[PDB]
Symmetry: D2
Subunit: 245 residues, 4 copies
């Protein structure tokens, strides 16, 4: 089996990605953040639903934390074949209100994380002549959003990274792609009051519904498959038609 690492693999989209990659026959390793005290309960729950994951702590905003995390995974589980950079946060405020701490938290967590997690896995992928790296961006990287100068900068920057790295390692059988989801039915979105969902969110989506986390997971599984080896440097929109270009 291919070994896959999914950052934020216990969160909304992350769990759906982890579940799908497991179901596709990959051996899945998730990370959990310093704020996450529920790793044991999550592992037990996942096993109750028939699935075995490995879990390791990491701070994706810290270079050394990432290096050490990957070192342990290679030691305990094995060489990393697939990396899904899914960890990310929001700190939404208009530029007028936005302070440096909240600019920084988003750039460091959402963009530095791509450098920090991808650098320690690439050499092995290249050496073996096979790898898949998938970066989870956002429709808001593509179109921008009010309150998201920080988030859009980070998420658009992710795709700049995708393209440069794709060029460096495409010849070695490693693909690097960006996935840009629209609104998904994760906890923080399904919690939105119905009046706002009906008048402000759903009318932006031609499909007329939220995307399922499982649908984004399916796209990630496709990119991670043996038959997706000719797709590289791309940014795939999965947004119900919310944005087209």
């Amino acid at each position: 089996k291919r070994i896959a690492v999914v950052t934020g693999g216990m969160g909304g989209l992350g769990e759906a990605v982890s579940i799908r990659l497991n179901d596709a026959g990959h051996r899945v390793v998730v990370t959990y953040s310093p704020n996450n005290t529920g790793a044991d309960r999550w592992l037990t729950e996942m096993h109750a639903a028939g699935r075995e994951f490995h879990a390791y702590p990491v701070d994706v905003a810290d270079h050394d934390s990432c290096q050490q995390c990957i070192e342990k995974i290679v030691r305990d589980v094995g060489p990393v074949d697939i990396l899904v950079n899914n960890a990310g946060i929001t700190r939404d405020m208009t530029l007028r209100k936005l302070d440096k701490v909240n600019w920084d938290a988003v750039i460091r967590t959402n963009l530095d994380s791509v450098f920090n997690m991808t650098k320690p896995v690439c050499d092995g992928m290249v050496e073996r002549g096979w790898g898949r790296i998938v970066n989870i961006s956002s429709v808001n990287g593509s179109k921008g959003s009010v309150g998201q100068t920080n988030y859009a900068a980070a998420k658009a920057g992710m795709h700049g990274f995708t393209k440069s790295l794709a060029l460096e390692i495409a010849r070695k059988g490693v693909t690097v792609n960006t996935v840009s989801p629209g609104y998904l039915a994760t906890k923080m979105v399904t919690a939105i009051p119905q009046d706002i969902l009906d008048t402000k969110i759903l009318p932006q989506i031609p499909a007329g519904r939220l995307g399922k986390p499982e649908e984004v997971a399916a796209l990630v599984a496709y990119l991670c498959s043996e038959e997706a080896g000719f797709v590289t440097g791309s940014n795939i929109a999965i947004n119900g038609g919310q944005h087209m270009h």
Copy 2:
């Protein structure tokens, strides 16, 4: 079982798509150009390999030809759930040398075809609340190419169609997407002398190899699957890194 129509389904990329959709479980119908003299021989060969197709003649440049073809498919096989607009030609000439006849041949065959074949299938898909339309473009629609003012205009036009149609019918469970392949190992390209392939074509492709038509077919199958419902109005690049944006 979903019923799929694949235009240009009997050779090159079309054949690969038709095989993949069949193996995905769909009932596949192919179109062939009216003066294609090998339809029965193709069906025999495919049936000898365990695949049961239907095949109908059509001129995709002719509006009435297309309407009537779909009517026969509906009568004989059943309602069309999936359409892959794959038929197309090249008539490469720099603008300096390009004539109106060859401008028209490419616009009519490559762009008018999308209107001609899609119009007769959409109402049924909308009525039933499910459909998939996949338009096959080219990397050259994205980046342009010398000698292809006609082909790039047609192929870029196809994606304009994709986006407008996607908006009209998204809310009714029908997706419309464009797939843009780079260099593929179809008969016309593998016929390239090996030294020309190595010195002139491969250096344009970071992957360092031609794409397999089966790889493109796999992407089309993903888009046609039940789990790709939140992808619409998109243009997915499958080009080994030849073009990024």
Copy 3:
């Protein structure tokens, strides 16, 4: 002077482009669908144009028009492909006649008008071709499978041609406008503009045809020689990518 041709140059956006290019120092020629009142009015205002009737969907009409222009004025340095129509209808109801009318008028015209001027530009080592597209080519629009196909196709043409002739000092670019304050848009009642159109535009107003004309004048200038194969959005933020 450079000589400029503006198709559809006597009304709407075309008129604003024609005026701006004249005022930039170009000798301007306009085309119209089958002009003295407009020509005389422009003359009174200190602007000398030539006007020719042309069917931009018809290849021979375009070739013959360009012949007259080279005779009467001189070789064409600048071409703005602005002529275009809409025939809006959802795919369900759109007939072949109205698909064709839009592809032929909006897309074939680019081939028909550009082919007869490009060789001269290349021979001389300088030229400017500007294709007027639409935001709706970039984003799609309901009832515009035809219009978006034609307008997106225009930019495929831009990119291929740009590659053919960049080395010889000719640039080819697309301009994609949003909502403009032309006659048929300003005829919209203010209540409908305020509640239906303006909320789509972050700028909160219609674009002026003169603003689009200024961008076209920039592209046609001596200092825009390193811009080619591009699609420039001028839409008040209505679409970004």
Copy 4:
């Protein structure tokens, strides 16, 4: 007269921008970095060629440095109407060899700078109902580049910032746009030896020549003009056809 601030205003492209904005009738203030010991000499040189500039020190990677710089400019010169975020560096290394120091240097200098410089000028532009913000990206943000996971991430991130801010403040008469140059005839590009220029650089450029810094300056001046008020959230390519999409 409008007051313009050009970061990196004494460097290759920045000087050209500064000269053109002055010639267009604006009052131009340049910044100079901590490592620049030539401000006095540059001001003298510029005045000997007929132009009066103001110059202030700043470290664009440092939020407080930029806030203080802007305070001084407003005190000494006047409120800022036009901001050109032109300062940027390269630290080119493949991801395999790229260390965190050089990742950070490029993200903080090239992307954090857009937040650090733009935040302190935006309120005033909004208050007066007129402003122009122009962010200098790169063709390599659009296409990616080998050795530039850092630079392309930063440069693509700049445009994410552009789009989100443009949405926040378009209604207030302020525009925000990205300009993405190709190869320019600045000191370090013209220094490249002739064999590499001829075989590696120029063949990537359909125009067959380097871009003049003055050409990019012309575009920036256009964007800063009173007539460009309906252009916002855009990314304008000025690259001699090197990349198209």
